[PDB]
Amino acid sequence: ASARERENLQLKLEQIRHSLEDDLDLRSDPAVQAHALQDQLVAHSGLHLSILDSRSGQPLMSFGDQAAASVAANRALLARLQADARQPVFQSWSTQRLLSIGASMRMKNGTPVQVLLSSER
Amino acid sequence: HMASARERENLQLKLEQIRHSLEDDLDLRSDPAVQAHALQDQLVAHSGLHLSILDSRSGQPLMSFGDQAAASVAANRALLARLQADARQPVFQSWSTGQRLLSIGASMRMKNGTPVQVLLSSER
Ligand SMILES: [Zn+2]
Ligand SMILES: [Zn+2]
Q: B23 and B13 in one domain?
């Protein structure tokens, strides 16, 4: 493994260490503590997920790496989705190089949502 | 400046995994908070990263989650053995079996006092 790959995994381990040793909530039970560690692993995974309400376009849920998030990219991708573009819709976004993919999904209760998944390239 | 066919295919696979978690989970309840939790768990499951945290005193897993494509039973066993033989930390491990993995391991002490061994693995 290369010098930069090793450097990057060491920086990720340091994020895990900070979560375990400094931020750990002593009041939480182990399953909550485990999910909080999960949150920190996904927070620097290069992946971001936005769930929008199909009716209003308003954000319902947002998870993952802020580094893979962009308000402008997500607005543009939602516009293509609402403009009947063939799904799933792809979008390359460079200002930072993101690849994103969007599609409508239907929750179990029928609630239509727009699902926008972004990735750092 | 545009994403390749392989980049597109890989991201489409992840989106379809997310769709499986929303539309094909027979036991997922309708409660909107419960839906957020399922999606967040599934995002980690294909993040290309896997994290194993073991109690140093017993060897028993305390936490395990992430992507199984990033995990190797054999590699983790070899890395854990290097940690327990007081190799210099953090310990790096490359591993191949078709796929090529990069893992890093270190001993830590959780805030509540538990001594743990941390095995972080990544798809190269
Ligand atoms: Zn912190
Ligand atoms: Zn969960």
A: yes
Q: Per the structure, how many domains does chain B have? A: 2
Contact call for B14 and A47, based on CB within 8 A: yes
Q: Which ligand is nearest to the CA of B39?
A: 2
Experimental approach: X-ray
How far away is chain B from the Cα of A110, in angstroms, using its nearest Cα? 9
A63 lies in the same domain as A77: yes
Judge if A62 and A101 occupy the same domain: yes
> Are B42 and B52 members of one domain?
no
Q: What angle do CA A113, B69, B33 make, to 5 degrees?
A: 30
Q: Tokens 């927070």 correspond to what residue?
A: A43
Give B35's contacts in chain A (Cβ within 8 Å).
61, 107
